[PDB]
């Protein structure tokens, strides 16, 4: 698909058996989901946004299905107000910016 | 231009006679630049990212050249660690996401 940017680029994701909506976010290095429980061990991480920092849990090698495309990667979980798909996962689904 | 997402999608901008690098940011509704002086009056605005909120100055009808494409729009100025080109200006330069 081509997605124009007149509205937020929200897509449906399936992760750990759950369906969510997530924002395709070229400005995010990382993928950040709201609180959910996930398989494997994790490590603590601080990530900086625009207003300051949040604490997250880093899960590696997590399966995510983004708009019907499977990707495996690092997913951070914590108190973000919107689910964010970052560049780490967009590269895996062949996602480009164009003009 | 096709831009892939293996690295940050940084482009060169010209605004207020100055050259800056800015991130093409599909996850930003608005355009936010580091501290700089700008024409016309402004209004105070609060914007919220990950980590919380920052205070900015909102300037309307500001000319910006993004990767050589002219756009006119709202530019927010304040303590962001990175210049961000948001959707409001991306739409003006014909910028899409694709996969
Ligand atoms: C800049 C901006 C607006 O003008 C309007 C609405 C949101 C935002 C905003 O902060 N957007 C952010 C997503 S986080 C987000 C939060 C709320 C709603 C939607 C997205 C950016 O797209 C990403 N954003 C761009 C940039 C913001 C300035 C500081 C450094 C990066 C931080 C990076 C970021 O947060 N990365 C994470 C891995 C932590 C997710």
Q: For every residue of A2-13, which 3-state class applies, written as one string?
A: EECCCCCCEEEE
Residue with tokens 């303590």: B79
Q: Bin A98: left if φ > 0, else alpha if -120 < ψ < 50, else beta.
A: beta
CATH number at residue B98: 2.40.70.10
Experimental method: X-ray
Residue A21, domain extent: 1-99
CA-atom Rg of chain B in angstroms:
13
Residue of A40, A34, A31 whose CA lies nearest to A59:
A40
Residue with tokens 């897509």: A11
Query: What is the spatial distance between Cα A62 and Cα A72, in angstroms, rounded to a whole number?
Result: 5
Query: What is the spatial distance between Cα A3 and Cα B78, in angstroms, rounded to a whole number?
Result: 29
Work out the widest C-alpha separation in chain B, in whole angstroms.
Answer: 41
- Can you name the residues that pair with A85 across neighbouring β-strands? A24
Residue with tokens 């207020």: B16
- Can you name the residues that pair with B76 across neighbouring β-strands? B32, B58
Identify the contact set of chain B against chain A, taking CB-CB distances under 8 A: 1-6, 8-9, 23-29, 32, 47-54, 67, 69, 80-81, 84, 87, 90-91, 93-99
The number of distinct structural domains making up chain B is 1
Resolution (A): 2.2
């Amino acid at each position: 698909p081509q997605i124009t940017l007149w509205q937020r680029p929200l897509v449906t994701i399936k992760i750990g058996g759950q369906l969510k909506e997530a924002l395709l976010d070229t400005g995010a290095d990382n993928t950040v989901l709201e609180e959910m429980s996930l398989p494997g061990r994790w490590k603590p991480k601080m990530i900086g946004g625009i207003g300051g920092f949040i604490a997250v849990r880093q899960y590696d090698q997590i399966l995510i299905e983004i708009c019907g495309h499977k990707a495996i990667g690092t997913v951070l979980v914590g108190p973000t107000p919107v689910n964010i798909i970052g560049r780490n996962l967009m590269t895996q689904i062949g996602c480009t910016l164009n003009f």
